[model samples]
Target: GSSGSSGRSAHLRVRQLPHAPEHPVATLSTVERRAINLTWTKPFDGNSPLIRYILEMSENNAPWTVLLASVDPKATSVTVKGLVPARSYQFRLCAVNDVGKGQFSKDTERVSLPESGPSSG
Candidate 1:
């Protein structure tokens, strides 16, 4: 293709898709707490509206699996619980939009759980 006569149009092409959410942080509010809180912020976006959020988890030494899939797009915080006590876990998160699923965020540091319930002694 050859360049046509000079045109006065303002643009040729522009594109975009939502970038992965950034700065995801996970925390255990207290030693006695049973749930971990997670939060993340939205980043650059494109020509699509966010559809949902996905949170994946890995136990002590297992493959990642869905924990909180389809979280509300407007919400940024989630508390995860009902895990095996005395085991460690890590998580990663990403966002979904009309175009496609965003990249997974960095894995969170391993968080070990405390044995804080009734058990045989």
Candidate 2:
């Protein structure tokens, strides 16, 4: 047997890293006197199945705070409780896979709990 131009040859394989996830859509699901519910669609997984998600929130121009560091990949919604009535809040999320965490999705529209409503008991 004879080897090709470069001399001895060996099998070679190349693999590509997964791409970032697509943007997610965040929306308000419910509102209450001291709480609000928010939901978001799973971003398009870039060739890899999503393993987890990170949820973050900000209040009235404050820096973003991580609400949920790791949420189940199957979940698409979350409820933020114990909020101060009439205070504005915003939320966003990032998808995670075997490769890494994707960029944060667009922030959710600002939301506020009704100041005058049934009291939490």
Candidate 3:
């Protein structure tokens, strides 16, 4: 077909790229005395692309305690620092998409780190 008088293509169009899944898979790294590393995998569904992830940490098993980290969805992992030594802690992971966040993955088992000791020997 001939171009329009304005010189613009009649069928010109644009489309957005497909999205990644938001069902994040979470896993905790070796717990340290004062920190816990959290890792997760991207979603398998192809919907809204993952924008980033939300890291939820708790001390008394209560939900919505604190936001440890908000890592890029592409990152797929983050480390939660500033934890208390010898104290028990829990964590959970979730994937966020353009539309919204998907259901959070299962939580990790509770872990307790050893407390710091006096250094005067």
Candidate 4:
């Protein structure tokens, strides 16, 4: 409470209303091409305590589905199995918290995996 108090002191840099997550990244794993490597960053907004991650994928573009990914909460990468290699599938990523789930990130890229493993032809 001063008369000449024009310059305010700098406050602590702190932080939204539970928003959707962003920044999705995916790669092909070397685990015989059965598992795809996908990781994402935390939500910039609120929605703390991220529970699980949603790793949605689709080769047909319209029919996307989820996989039973990491449950470690703080895990960066997700381990999803049962992917058909050589299909160049598209994957979208998001996070789920106690409040709600977030949105997708950079999902405009497709993974080109080699035809791994043995097959009967």
Stretches off by above 4 angstroms in model 1 are: 1-15, 117-121
Q: Model 2: how far is 73 from its true place, Å?
A: 1.0
For model 4, how does the per-residue alpha-carbon lDDT over 7-100 read when each residue is reduced to its tens digit?
A: 7566553222234445566777866456778766666545256777666677745477665555555676676677676666777666666666
Per-model CA lDDT versus the true structure:
0.75, 0.67, 0.57, 0.62
> How far off is model 2, as Cα RMSD?
9.3
Q: How accurate is candidate 2 locally (lDDT)?
A: 0.67
Judging by TM-score against the true structure, name the best candidate.
1
- Model 2 residue 5 lDDT? 75
| Candidate 2, backbone clash total | 0
Error of 4 at 21 (Å): 4.6
RMSD of each: 6.6, 9.3, 10.9, 9.2
Which tens-of-lDDT digit does each residue in 1-121 have in candidate 3? 9766755444433222323333333333464436666655566433446666666766755665647445677775666767666667666666666656665665656656556776432
lDDT-superior candidate, 2 or 4: 2
Residue pairs clashing in model 3 are 52-73
- On a 0 to 100 scale, what is the lDDT of residue 105 in model 3? 60
Q: Which candidate is the best by lDDT?
A: 1
Error of 4 at 115 (Å): 2.2
lDDT for model 1: 0.75
Higher-lDDT candidate of 1 and 4: 1
